[PDB]
Design an enzyme around this catalytic site. Structure first.
Site, short mmCIF file in Angstrom:
data_model
loop_
_atom_site.label_atom_id
_atom_site.label_comp_id
_atom_site.label_asym_id
_atom_site.label_seq_id
_atom_site.Cartn_x
_atom_site.Cartn_y
_atom_site.Cartn_z
N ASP A 65 0.83 -1.22 0.00
CA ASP A 65 0.00 0.00 0.00
C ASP A 65 0.86 1.26 0.00
O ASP A 65 1.36 1.70 1.03
CB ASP A 65 -0.91 -0.02 1.21
CG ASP A 65 -1.87 1.16 1.25
OD1 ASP A 65 -1.81 2.00 0.34
OD2 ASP A 65 -2.64 1.26 2.24
N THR A 66 1.05 1.82 -1.19
CA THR A 66 1.96 2.93 -1.35
C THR A 66 1.38 4.23 -0.79
O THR A 66 2.12 5.20 -0.62
CB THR A 66 2.35 3.12 -2.83
OG1 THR A 66 1.18 3.29 -3.66
CG2 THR A 66 3.12 1.93 -3.30
N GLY A 67 0.06 4.27 -0.54
CA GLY A 67 -0.58 5.43 0.07
C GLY A 67 -0.54 5.41 1.62
O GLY A 67 -1.02 6.35 2.27
#
Ligand SMILES: CC(C)C(NC(=O)[C@H](C)NC(=O)OCc1ccccc1)C(=O)N[C@@H](Cc1ccccc1)[C@@H](O)[C@H](O)[C@H](Cc1ccccc1)NC(=O)[C@@H](NC(=O)[C@H](C)NC(=O)OCc1ccccc1)C(C)C
Ligand SMILES: O=C(O)c1ccc2c(CN3CCOCC3)c[nH]c2c1
EC number: 3.4.23.16
Lengths: 99, 99
Positions: free
Chosen positions: B25-27
């Site tokens: 999850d890059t966010g």
């Protein structure tokens, strides 16, 4: 590009003539913008996250350019402290995760 | 591994000798996992996402393997609906976005 993750992966986007920035977010199914005035009528829609659930406004067939790559799809307007580009648009720009 | 984003970037992880699945999850700035017992001391911490804030237990220096890449770092534990690997461990495994 190849973007490392030492800071938030914010990129410039263009939507309705306006330049904004947004977060490339592999954990978002959907694309979610905070304010952006998208034109006309919207469908109500629920989305969820770690805190629980919230109502947002769905607009369909929206053109966003992301780093020069054009993407057309669904964009939600909702209470997010940052603009979020979700997988629905990430896929259209050919975005992958690599390690 | 190259991972496309037509579906959720779920992967196998090992933590405390258990195999689990977790979302790349890059966010997410931080890594949040379902309640489990981990070694050492925790401190209370609150984190914000869609639909508000939750209380998590923070553990430091936790060993986690993500597709056979060892990372050591901070793991937050609490009532997340999904196990999340955030930037703090994604950078450790050399995870990048590419388009
Ligand atoms: C943006 C959403 C549409 C996104 N949700 C989805 O894609 C969901 C699962 N899909 C979905 O809702 O589909 C429709 C449907 C209908 C209802 C029932 C089921 C399905 C999301 O919350 N995704 C997050 C991961 C996730 C996945 C599934 C379930 C729970 C968590 C992160 O990727 C995404 O990056 C969010 C973005 C976020 C950031 C800040 C607040 C609001 C939104 N980060 C986070 O939730 C985390 N925050 C952070 O990394 C740092 C700490 N937080 C932060 O800076 O908060 C600042 C602050 C908080 C509160 C208000 C003001 C600012 C967290 C995982 C650690
Ligand atoms: O596991 C628990 O028993 C627990 C209990 C309380 C908290 C808190 C309380 N906070 C910390 C940060 O500031 C506001 C409120 C966070 N995690 C927690 C976990």
């Amino acid at each position: 590009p190849q973007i490392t993750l030492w800071k938030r992966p914010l990129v410039t986007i263009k939507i309705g003539g306006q330049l904004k920035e947004a977060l490339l977010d592999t954990g978002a199914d959907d694309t979610v913008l905070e304010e952006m005035n998208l034109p006309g009528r919207w469908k109500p829609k629920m989305i969820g996250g770690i805190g629980g659930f919230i109502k947002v406004r769905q607009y369909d067939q929206i053109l966003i350019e992301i780093c020069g790559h054009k993407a057309i799809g669904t964009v939600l307007v909702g209470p997010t402290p940052v603009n979020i580009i979700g997988r629905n648009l990430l896929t259209q720009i050919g975005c992958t995760l690599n390690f």
